[PDB]
Scaffold this active site. Structure first.
Site, PDB file in Angstrom:
ATOM      1  N   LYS A   1       0.529   5.885  -0.621  1.00  0.00           N
ATOM      2  CA  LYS A   1      -0.422   6.917  -0.251  1.00  0.00           C
ATOM      3  C   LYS A   1      -1.515   7.115  -1.281  1.00  0.00           C
ATOM      4  O   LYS A   1      -2.604   7.531  -0.885  1.00  0.00           O
ATOM      5  CB  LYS A   1       0.243   8.227   0.129  1.00  0.00           C
ATOM      6  CG  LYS A   1       1.081   8.830  -0.931  1.00  0.00           C
ATOM      7  CD  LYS A   1       1.702  10.172  -0.430  1.00  0.00           C
ATOM      8  CE  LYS A   1       2.742   9.956   0.693  1.00  0.00           C
ATOM      9  NZ  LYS A   1       3.327  11.234   1.236  1.00  0.00           N
TER      10      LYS A   1
ATOM     11  N   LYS B   1      -2.773  -2.633  -9.540  1.00  0.00           N
ATOM     12  CA  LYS B   1      -2.547  -1.428  -8.741  1.00  0.00           C
ATOM     13  C   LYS B   1      -3.809  -0.573  -8.812  1.00  0.00           C
ATOM     14  O   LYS B   1      -4.108   0.001  -9.857  1.00  0.00           O
ATOM     15  CB  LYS B   1      -1.358  -0.663  -9.315  1.00  0.00           C
ATOM     16  CG  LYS B   1      -1.001   0.585  -8.597  1.00  0.00           C
ATOM     17  CD  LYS B   1       0.211   1.306  -9.383  1.00  0.00           C
ATOM     18  CE  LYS B   1       0.742   2.435  -8.609  1.00  0.00           C
ATOM     19  NZ  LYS B   1       1.945   2.852  -9.271  1.00  0.00           N
TER      20      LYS B   1
ATOM     21  N   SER C   1      -2.340   4.467  -3.743  1.00  0.00           N
ATOM     22  CA  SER C   1      -2.530   3.218  -4.474  1.00  0.00           C
ATOM     23  C   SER C   1      -2.365   2.036  -3.534  1.00  0.00           C
ATOM     24  O   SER C   1      -1.766   2.171  -2.470  1.00  0.00           O
ATOM     25  CB  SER C   1      -1.485   3.131  -5.585  1.00  0.00           C
ATOM     26  OG  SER C   1      -0.148   3.162  -5.098  1.00  0.00           O
ATOM     27  N   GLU C   2      -2.883   0.879  -3.933  1.00  0.00           N
ATOM     28  CA  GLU C   2      -2.590  -0.384  -3.280  1.00  0.00           C
ATOM     29  C   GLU C   2      -2.378  -1.388  -4.409  1.00  0.00           C
ATOM     30  O   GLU C   2      -3.026  -1.316  -5.464  1.00  0.00           O
ATOM     31  CB  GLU C   2      -3.753  -0.834  -2.426  1.00  0.00           C
ATOM     32  CG  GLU C   2      -3.965  -0.053  -1.144  1.00  0.00           C
ATOM     33  CD  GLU C   2      -4.816  -0.749  -0.122  1.00  0.00           C
ATOM     34  OE1 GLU C   2      -5.706  -1.520  -0.497  1.00  0.00           O
ATOM     35  OE2 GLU C   2      -4.605  -0.578   1.105  1.00  0.00           O
ATOM     36  N   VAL C   3      -1.486  -2.335  -4.159  1.00  0.00           N
ATOM     37  CA  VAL C   3      -1.116  -3.347  -5.110  1.00  0.00           C
ATOM     38  C   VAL C   3      -1.518  -4.712  -4.596  1.00  0.00           C
ATOM     39  O   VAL C   3      -1.341  -5.042  -3.421  1.00  0.00           O
ATOM     40  CB  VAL C   3       0.362  -3.317  -5.519  1.00  0.00           C
ATOM     41  CG1 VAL C   3       0.590  -2.211  -6.569  1.00  0.00           C
ATOM     42  CG2 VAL C   3       1.294  -3.190  -4.395  1.00  0.00           C
TER      43      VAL C   3
ATOM     44  N   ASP D   1      11.964   8.309  -8.405  1.00  0.00           N
ATOM     45  CA  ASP D   1      11.729   7.542  -7.179  1.00  0.00           C
ATOM     46  C   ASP D   1      12.524   6.249  -7.212  1.00  0.00           C
ATOM     47  O   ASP D   1      12.032   5.202  -6.791  1.00  0.00           O
ATOM     48  CB  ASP D   1      10.253   7.321  -6.951  1.00  0.00           C
ATOM     49  CG  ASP D   1       9.887   6.913  -5.539  1.00  0.00           C
ATOM     50  OD1 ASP D   1      10.669   7.158  -4.601  1.00  0.00           O
ATOM     51  OD2 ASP D   1       8.783   6.319  -5.416  1.00  0.00           O
TER      52      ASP D   1
ATOM     53  N   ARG E   1       0.847  -1.176   0.000  1.00  0.00           N
ATOM     54  CA  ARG E   1       0.000   0.000   0.000  1.00  0.00           C
ATOM     55  C   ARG E   1       0.890   1.236   0.000  1.00  0.00           C
ATOM     56  O   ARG E   1       1.884   1.300   0.740  1.00  0.00           O
ATOM     57  CB  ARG E   1      -0.879   0.032   1.265  1.00  0.00           C
ATOM     58  CG  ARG E   1      -1.740   1.246   1.422  1.00  0.00           C
ATOM     59  CD  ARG E   1      -2.311   1.363   2.849  1.00  0.00           C
ATOM     60  NE  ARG E   1      -3.104   2.586   2.988  1.00  0.00           N
ATOM     61  CZ  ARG E   1      -2.586   3.820   2.984  1.00  0.00           C
ATOM     62  NH1 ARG E   1      -1.263   3.997   2.862  1.00  0.00           N
ATOM     63  NH2 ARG E   1      -3.385   4.888   3.092  1.00  0.00           N
TER      64      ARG E   1
END
Ligand SMILES: O=C(O)c1cccc(Nc2nc(-c3ccccn3)cs2)c1
Length: 327
Positions: A44, A63, A46-48, A151, A42
């Site tokens: 900020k 995602k 999105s969650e996978v 990133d 998880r």
């Protein structure tokens, strides 16, 4: 000002539609084809999940994006489309929506993830060279496509150490490079932020990713992970300056006419540039060579312009054993 040494004009030389992501209209397929199996992570926005495509039994990563971020969703989607087929870039299989809520999701190829904290303590010299070379392929590719990842960090460098596969993931912070554009410095993980970000210099470029890569290389060859372990963004720069030196920092600021936040005056102290050999000890000596240190010294430089490009890094003698083996 400042410009990239490579790939500076490549977006201006392409059709506007290539880089004008606000104008992009994705084709949203049907998320009902996917069965979620397990949560993987998880963030900020999105969650996978691990998932299975029920129509063909393919294992994928889904995602699910928090939908309020429309411009940022278009940005990530358009970047991933532009990077299609790029070496070692995570493959976007499809862009889908829940057909009722219209919440969007991205479907990626599945990769086995060897946990980096454990992996980075058992890599061989050749493994580090191999994986760094594979990561450099991805960065040279995205830079050549006019895109900064912004990133780069171990979590975003998925390594399947069984199959010797690497993918650069999570393009949610990525941006198109345009000469003279001023970018948000609130990108990258603290430990992987280049000095340019920490000193609020907005006219950065692809070379930001090369700093982050250098930080990863240092952590691998020296086994200190993360290599520069700041407690906050201010302390992050102090940790860098304790290695690269304070007079050297001030020369960089002078060259680019960079204003330094006055809170730094109380914390930077006075530090000589350290020899990279200072980080060698019995636990990491087998991973360190003159050619590793020469490469590292050319990446972890204050002056973003003077850092090696991804291609120059790939061409360094440190990678000769890898190139020879893949021939
Ligand atoms: O945002 C993205 O582009 C993206 C694309 C793919 C994967 C992930 N993120 C994660 N994948 C795992 C994972 C995957 C397989 C096995 C175990 N863990 C953990 S977090 C994010």
């Amino acid at each position: 000002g400042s410009r990239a040494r490579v790939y500076a004009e490549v977006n201006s030389l392409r059709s506007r539609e290539y880089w004008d992501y606000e104008a992009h209209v994705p084709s949203w397929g049907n998320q009902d084809d996917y069965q979620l199996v397990r949560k993987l992570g998880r963030g900020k926005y999105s969650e996978v999940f691990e998932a299975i495509n029920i129509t063909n039994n393919e294992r994928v990563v889904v995602k699910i994006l928090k939908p309020v971020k429309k411009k940022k969703i278009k940005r990530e989607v358009k970047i991933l489309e532009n990077l299609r087929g790029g070496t070692n870039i995570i493959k976007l299989i499809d862009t889908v929506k829940d057909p009722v809520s219209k919440t969007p999701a991205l479907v990626f190829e599945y990769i086995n993830n060897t946990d980096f904290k454990q992996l980075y303590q058992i890599l061989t010299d050749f493994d580090i060279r191999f994986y760094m070379y594979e990561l450099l392929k991805a960065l040279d590719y995205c830079h050549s496509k006019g895109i900064m990842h912004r990133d780069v960090k171990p979590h975003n460098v998925m390594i399947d150490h069984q199959q010797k596969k690497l993918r650069l993931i999570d393009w949610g912070l990525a941006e198109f490079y345009h000469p003279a554009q001023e970018y948000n410095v609130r990108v990258a993980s603290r430990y992987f932020k280049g000095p340019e970000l920490l000193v609020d210099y907005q006219m950065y470029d692809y070379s930001l990713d090369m700093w982050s890569l250098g930080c990863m290389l240092a952590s691998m060859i020296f086994r200190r992970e993360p290599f520069f372990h700041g407690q906050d963004n201010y302390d992050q720069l102090v940790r860098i300056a304790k290695v690269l030196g304070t007079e050297e920092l001030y020369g960089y600021l002078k060259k680019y006419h960079i204003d330094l936040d006055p809170h730094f005056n109380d914390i930077l102290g006075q530090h000589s540039r350290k020899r990279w050999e200072n980080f060698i000890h019995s636990e990491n000596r087998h991973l360190v060579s003159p050619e590793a240190l020469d490469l590292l010294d050319k990446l972890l430089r204050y002056d973003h312009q003077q850092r090696l490009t991804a291609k120059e890094a790939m061409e360094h003698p440190y990678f000769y054993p890898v190139v020879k083996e893949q021939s």
